[PDB]
Design an enzyme around this catalytic site. Structure first.
Site, PDB file in Angstrom:
ATOM      1  N   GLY A  47       0.762  -1.142  -0.063  1.00 54.62           N
ATOM      2  CA  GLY A  47       0.152   0.042   0.175  1.00 54.62           C
ATOM      3  C   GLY A  47       0.779   1.216   0.086  1.00 54.62           C
ATOM      4  N   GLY A  48       0.239   2.316   0.385  1.00 52.50           N
ATOM      5  CA  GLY A  48       0.818   3.555   0.486  1.00 52.50           C
ATOM      6  C   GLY A  48       2.269   3.522   1.178  1.00 52.50           C
ATOM      7  N   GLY A  52      25.662  14.237 -27.664  1.00 57.39           N
ATOM      8  CA  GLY A  52      24.900  14.592 -26.248  1.00 57.39           C
ATOM      9  C   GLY A  52      25.450  13.678 -25.260  1.00 57.39           C
ATOM     10  N   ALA A  53      25.650  12.656 -25.263  1.00 50.77           N
ATOM     11  CA  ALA A  53      26.069  11.698 -24.223  1.00 50.77           C
ATOM     12  C   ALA A  53      27.525  12.207 -23.546  1.00 50.77           C
ATOM     13  CB  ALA A  53      26.517  10.127 -24.956  1.00 50.77           C
TER      14      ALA A  53
END
Lengths: 168, 353, 176, 176
Positions: free
Chosen positions: B5-6, B242-243
């Site tokens: 759950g949360g 870009g790498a």
């Protein structure tokens, strides 16, 4: 070879040799004849043995004005880096008179700016060893821009990190 | 044990999560519900077991074989970090011997001749760290990039390195996020970061784009650009497009950028470049369309596929003999430890999510 | 999507108004495997970090973790309003009764289910509303839906002078 | 005179507008001996330190160090404008040709000088303007002299919110 890793390492060793001897043998002779030492000899006297780490050793100028692009010596006329003096951190630049008469150029200037930014960033002194004929005229205004950038760092670092000028 | 759950969001917010193989589980929704809602039959182990969260979801940072090893792993984790962000990580200073050892020398031959044959980046890392000890985190997630801790002269350092053994060291969504969070973790806790580069670019694929690589890959550049701790980068081999920018480049703020003679720093691969630059030059004379291109390609790689143009511009502070990497890192960290920098004032940044 | 937006507003001093009607998280193996645990946490982090004014209105469903996530008072929201139609609970009635009454239901297969459906109907009539949350102050008030605008306007007037800050740090380490 | 004034304006948040037409420093043994090196540096220091808005207009001559000194962009000026009549160069054409063409001129004493004067005239036609400086962005724009007022006014509107500061220190160590 060259296309092999070993060949690339040998290629580096060749460039290192050319970089450390950027100035002509004759230029070095005249410098010594005037009772002056070379840029690298001066740094070696200042820094603690083996502490010197050179920055931008393979820098080269980007000018094509007045046939300047005919000669692009490694380091572009100034030896820069950091090390220790009596075990304490110090940043340093040493102008090389044997290269273009030590005339301050664009890349030449950027190298000094990198040394200054580094000293301001880490908080250590900057020792500038001066020996230059003046502005590298072939580069026109680009030469003045480099000066201006240095002047600004000088002013901003004023009273922040010690700045000593060795004029030889 | 279980985290359902949360409750899962608490560990998610923490810095490191360590799980135990087949005895711990994390999940927002239980098998029972996903079944009646999706018709999917999945067991607890497949849904959110330790192996699943350590190699598929990117949430856990380690999968130990038992609780005894798990506890030991956190102790190790704690040993590399400060008690709080007000101090530097704990250190047991010891001056290193900088003379070239037989181990250092090995580095001069670690990179094979063929631009394709891979080598283990783990070796490179170990050769620079004290006692060749490298404490890795998230080993099973995005194996194409390595993250972890080690020490230089007794001082904690973080590591980020492309791994040529997996996906030829290419970056992708997962590697970007794994590395991005680690870098930010190190920076928040004043831990210096050492990065080793051998990246040919981003893993191609429709899925990468559709899944949001543009905003997810941006996370790594933001992390490096935001960092104020000391940053030293060593490009061992490939660094394209870009790498190259992403992997702790000087443009982002790295303090010392070293490159081996084997480094290849270019906008793109030789073939991809010559195909654009010499489109017309090769178009003319269909007669022998190709040896000429294989010549243009050969020329392009011999002229630009190295670190020297980047060196001319100061993009790399130095091109060094691989065997001297440890020395540069040691002497570089000594000067850099007093680094003081800050970003413009703000409540916080707006990093891509 | 919401997390980045909340952080954007906060960074630029823009108050955030949030309206809640969430039954929980979308079930699915894909959600887990793609990292809902770390990607979902980004919203709680964004709300907990925010220092601009925060006004939350629960119009209907607010179950489990999702209730915590949607700018709950526990995260730091300044004013939490709820309509009479709001249902604030740990989980849906059915899921809740199966756990709470697993034994009393197992008893007598005879009449297994209508008693099951009975408990479900009883559970929702007792807990599927905003009143338990109102008792603990989790919501500052239960309001008539038509008074939502008045509360927002008057709340924003008082909240505009809000001044709060997190512990000093270079930056946080939000899940990535 | 200018240095003290610039520091005064800066200390009291007064923007500084500077107009340039300087061929260099006044030659003279007296200038050197009386300390022009340390006394002249006071102006660059004043400009580099200033954080108030700085707008510079080069109307004509801007040679060597003087160009750097007169609130150049390199010192931190925010907007640098130049008229078509501006001449931004390392040095005067004559001085520059004597260094650059010392050899080609030495050749053939025959016709030593008209070729000399030729090179000078060529040098000034190629470099004695603001366009090389404009190419590198040293000047933000080359403007018609009559647009000087418009640029100043609109520049000052954008620059009034300027916020900058030097590295922390008790104080600087300006040349004395």
């Amino acid at each position: 070879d060259i296309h092999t890793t070993a060949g690339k390492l040998a290629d580096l060793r060749r460039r290192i040799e050319e970089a450390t001897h950027a100035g002509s043998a004759r230029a070095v002779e005249k410098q010594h004849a005037k009772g002056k030492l070379t840029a690298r000899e001066r740094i070696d006297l200042l820094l603690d043995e083996g502490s010197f780490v050179e920055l931008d050793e393979f820098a080269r100028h980007r000018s094509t004005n007045f046939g300047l692009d005919a000669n692009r010596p490694y380091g572009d006329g100034v030896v820069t880096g950091y090390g220790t003096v009596d075990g304490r951190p110090v940043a340093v630049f040493s102008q090389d008179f044997t290269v273009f008469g030590g005339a301050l150029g664009e890349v030449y200037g950027q190298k000094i700016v990198k040394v200054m930014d580094f000293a301001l960033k880490t908080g250590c002194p900057v020792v500038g060893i001066n020996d230059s004929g003046g502005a590298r005229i072939q580069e026109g205004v680009a030469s003045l821009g480099a000066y201006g950038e240095i002047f600004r760092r000088n002013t901003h670092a004023s009273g922040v990190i010690p700045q000593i000028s060795l004029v030889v | 044990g279980p985290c359902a759950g949360g409750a899962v969001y608490s560990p998610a917010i923490t810095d490191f999560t360590v799980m135990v193989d087949q005895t711990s589980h994390m999940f927002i929704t239980g098998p029972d519900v996903i079944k009646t809602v999706t018709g999917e039959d999945v067991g607890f182990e497949e849904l959110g077991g330790a192996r699943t969260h350590n190699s598929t979801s990117g949430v856990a940072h380690h999968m130990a074989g038992d609780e005894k090893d798990a506890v030991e792993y956190v102790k190790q984790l704690l040993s590399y970090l400060p008690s709080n962000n007000l101090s530097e990580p704990p250190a047991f200073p010891e001056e290193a011997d900088l003379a070239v050892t037989d181990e250092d020398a090995e580095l001069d031959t670690i990179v094979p001749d063929s631009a394709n044959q891979p080598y283990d980046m783990h070796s490179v890392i170990e050769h620079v760290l004290d006692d060749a000890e490298f404490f890795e985190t998230q080993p099973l997630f995005a194996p194409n990039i390595l993250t972890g801790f080690g020490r230089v002269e007794g001082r904690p350092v973080g590591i980020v390195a492309n791994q040529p053994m997996q996906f030829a060291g290419c970056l992708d969504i997962t590697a970007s996020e794994k590395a991005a969070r680690f870098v930010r973790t190190c920076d928040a806790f004043n831990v210096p970061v050492l990065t080793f580069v051998d990246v040919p670019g981003f893993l191609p694929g429709v899925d990468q784009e559709h899944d949001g690589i543009i905003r997810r890959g941006a996370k790594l550049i933001f992390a490096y650009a935001e960092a104020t701790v000391p940053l030293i980068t060593v490009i061992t081999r490939k660094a394209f497009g870009g790498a190259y920018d992403v992997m702790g480049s000087k443009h982002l703020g790295a303090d010392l950028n070293l490159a081996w003679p084997t480094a290849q720093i270019a906008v793109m691969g030789a073939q991809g470049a010559v195909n654009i630059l010499h489109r017309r030059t090769i178009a003319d004379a269909g007669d022998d369309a190709e040896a000429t291109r294989a010549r243009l390609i050969q020329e392009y790689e011999d002229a630009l596929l190295n670190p020297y143009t980047a060196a001319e511009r100061g993009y790399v502070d130095a091109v060094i003999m691989p065997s001297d990497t440890r020395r540069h890192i040691v002497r570089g960290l000594r000067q850099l430890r007093t680094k003081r920098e800050s970003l413009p004032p703000k409540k916080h940044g707006n990093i891509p999510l």
